[PDB]
From a paper:
In metazoans, this activating phosphorylation is catalysed by the [name]-activating kinase ([name]), itself a [name]-cyclin complex consisting of [name], cyclin H, and [name] (7–10). The [name] integrates regulation of both [name] activity and transcription, as it also phosphorylates the C-terminal domain (CTD) of the largest subunit of RNA polymerase II (Pol II) as a component of the general transcription factor IIH (TFIIH).
We present structures of [name]-[name]-cyclin A2 bound to AMP-PNP and in the nucleotide-free (apo) state and of [name]-[name] in the presence of ADP-nitrate or ADP-AlFx at resolutions of 2.4-3.2 Å. Although the nitrate or AlFx groups were not observed in our cryo-EM maps, these reconstructions still provided additional insights into the T-loop conformations of [name]-bound [name]. This may help explain why the [name] has a higher enzyme turnover, indicating a higher rate of phosphorylation, on monomeric compared to cyclin-bound [name] (22).
Residue numbers in the entry:
A (entry chain J): 11 to 30, 36 to 165, 171 to 310
B (entry chain I): 1 to 38, 44 to 129, 135 to 238, 244 to 284
C (entry chain H): 244 to 308
D (entry chain K): 6 to 21, 28 to 36, 48 to 147, 164 to 284
Write the structure that this text describes.
Amino acid sequence: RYEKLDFLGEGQFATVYKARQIVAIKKIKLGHRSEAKDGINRTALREIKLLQELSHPNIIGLLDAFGHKSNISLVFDFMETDLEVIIKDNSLVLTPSHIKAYMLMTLQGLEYLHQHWILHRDLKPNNLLLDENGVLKLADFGLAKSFGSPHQVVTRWYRAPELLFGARMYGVGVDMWAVGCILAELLLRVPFLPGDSDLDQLTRIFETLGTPTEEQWPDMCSLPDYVTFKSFPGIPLHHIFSAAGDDLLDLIQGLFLFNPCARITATQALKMKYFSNRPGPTPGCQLPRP
Amino acid sequence: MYHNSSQKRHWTFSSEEQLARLRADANRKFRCKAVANGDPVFLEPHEEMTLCKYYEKRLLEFCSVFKPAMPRSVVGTACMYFKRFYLNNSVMEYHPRIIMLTCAFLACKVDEFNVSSPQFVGNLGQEKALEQILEYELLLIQQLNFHLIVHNPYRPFEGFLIDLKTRYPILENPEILRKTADDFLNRIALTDAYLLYTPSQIALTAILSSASRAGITMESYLSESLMLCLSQLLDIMKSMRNLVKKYEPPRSEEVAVLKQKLERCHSAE
Amino acid sequence: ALYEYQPLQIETYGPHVPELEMLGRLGYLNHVRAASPQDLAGGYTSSLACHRALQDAFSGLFWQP
Amino acid sequence: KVEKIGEGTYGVVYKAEVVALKKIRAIREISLLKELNHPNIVKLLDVIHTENKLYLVFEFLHQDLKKFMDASALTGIPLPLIKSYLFQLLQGLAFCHSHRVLHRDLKPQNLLINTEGAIKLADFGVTLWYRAPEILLGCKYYSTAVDIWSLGCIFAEMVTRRALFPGDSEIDQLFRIFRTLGTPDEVVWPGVTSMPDYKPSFPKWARQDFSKVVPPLDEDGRSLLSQMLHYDPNKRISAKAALAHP
Ligand SMILES: Nc1ncnc2c1ncn2[C@@H]1O[C@H](COP(=O)(O)OP(=O)(O)O)[C@@H](O)[C@H]1O
Ligand SMILES: Nc1ncnc2c1ncn2[C@@H]1O[C@H](COP(=O)(O)OP(=O)(O)O)[C@@H](O)[C@H]1O
Ligand SMILES: [Mg+2]
């Protein structure tokens, strides 16, 4: 049915093969002997149960989910590269229009996801795949969870401060902080807050953006894994991003607000001034490719 | 959301005639396969339907006493999985005694009710049952056409209750409508209405039936607060009430003889 | 070339759902449980729960197969 | 192949005397497993180098320690059995520390057990539950006391049938360690105020007796666990010293 064409990669959870319309077959691993009586892995089941109810051009789609015995294989579309490779590539130049287009695609996908009450929870530059037509699509829905009804978190480099402080219940703010970190990485071509641990990540965040008081984060001590910090002044935003405009600076400030409720959402961000300014976002055909 | 999901697109049928046609087609396919492999032991579609409803009641009882705390959305998803599975497949090919357990396991896994295999099998030969569920999980998932999301009417019921408490001042205490309507929901659980009408409509007709039983009319709610169409929705609710009314539970002797016959078929092949 | 905002249009097949911002003034939030400080810190509000419940209650009410 | 045991993050494990074959699509693990010859550690028998994949041959043990306590959660592991297991693990760790090698990944899932009653080390090349406070507090130095800390955590989990510090995040893990073993004062742990990830605003939790931390253990076992569970890496009892412990 699907002849294997090439080997793509292998992670802790599953192994991906490029097969023949060219598609990608991700086969989950049986796991250790302590995870042999659990049948089908919960990550693949989550991907199936969440990808069969969404249909958006900026969300990865499950073409098929054929399996045999206890092994299950998920069929996704084939993507040429991802945003992490674009960030780490030194041969190309990331103009402001390219960053605007990437942010627009990510925010449209996030808006569609939040309309149906789903949190991606794993937003990273390598989780934003790019196809041959230059269309960004969110992927790795193994951590996605539906929210709205009253510890799987993204890596510390993009973890929101509420997640770093151990927030059990949260809204769309965590994805908003993650996409803000992605924007900062796009601008500076480097991990904006490359912490070595959770405490180091919090220290770097508070040094780069300033430790907020109760006037900016009304509820701080309520979180269980909360530690008090020194009053770091915080580097001014325009000093960090010298080539950024005032509208882009306002968008970054909104994306990096320490109050998740006051932090701008996908809908609020999409209609902001930055995306409506000049020039317009780059068309997908002209986006850089490594 | 339901209005853009696979349940509305594929698992909601116009009338009970389609359900009867699919069940008869499944029985005919099983009979053809058996006669091609190489007659009184066969079961008519009505016997299959009776056995399926008896095993659905058994699944209800099993999920009622399941440990630890078992939510109701997961039970609803398990029951809907059972109905979807046995709509297109025959009861004698896969024994429902283990199929209901497989459906409960799949519902617990899908609905994020984190539980392990030892805990699941401790609620019940346990090793044999675990092996059977592990073998049948992929088959059950494939039979559901990889559509493992199911919208129960309890959330629309709560939303309708909140909206009625907010925008309807004629009715004083909505709590009096919590019990009876819920009871009606349970009846709609046994009826095939879960495969015929949307969960919001089911919650609405349950609420209106409870109000009518209590003696409080709600035509003003539907006509004005909902901007309402009206005759169409009222006819849908009337059909729901008729479907609930015409349902009857199987007798003990028929259930026993059907179970004996099913055991005979499963031991013969 | 400038990007012009346009809200997504999806048919709910039911009564119009009130806006999330207006839920405070329309009085819906008085008929639910108040949000704790803990989940308010993380950005979780009772307004989101009320909006989801209302959206699901009105989802696919005027639809036929 | 007899059967497929499973597959981890790298390679595929098959069963095939009965041995285990690991398929890898590396050299460091081979070098680390070839230089020691001990009866309390998994021995790499043969290495097969092929242009398709690399094959590593090890002895076969039916299950691991994690599944052993999972199955014996209700039955309860008798004290002589866990004592023998701990002594064998300590002997293996002492032999490893005699050479210039570090494990740093001691978890019950990584420890394998046989039918005769012998436990051997494995995987010589998520895990927050068995992390030392030195590593958690952002110290780049990788001493030999981290293995002793992880072994003490495994021992406590085995005796108490429950993980000693079942934290979910690094900050929560450190908080649980602080609650269970008090605040790492400067006098208790010299140089604690020097690691990059130490904050003076940490909660000042108080130490509690091990009688409620690990109830069923004996006085000697509690003393050994306390010596293995030391904030100061220099004061942690070495594997060789732990071997000669009553
Ligand atoms: N749609 C896709 N097309 C091609 N490759 C994909 C696709 N989705 C995922 N991958 C592959 O998955 C790999 C990333 O896996 P990863 O997220 O690290 O796994 P884990 O989440 O278990 O750590 C990448 O190397 C990429 O090649
Ligand atoms: N020599 C062996 N004997 C018995 N079981 C083994 C052997 N080697 C590996 N295994 C089994 O294979 C599984 C995966 O082991 P491993 O590859 O070390 O995991 P990872 O590399 O992902 O940490 C383990 O559960 C273990 O029980
Ligand atoms: Mg990925």
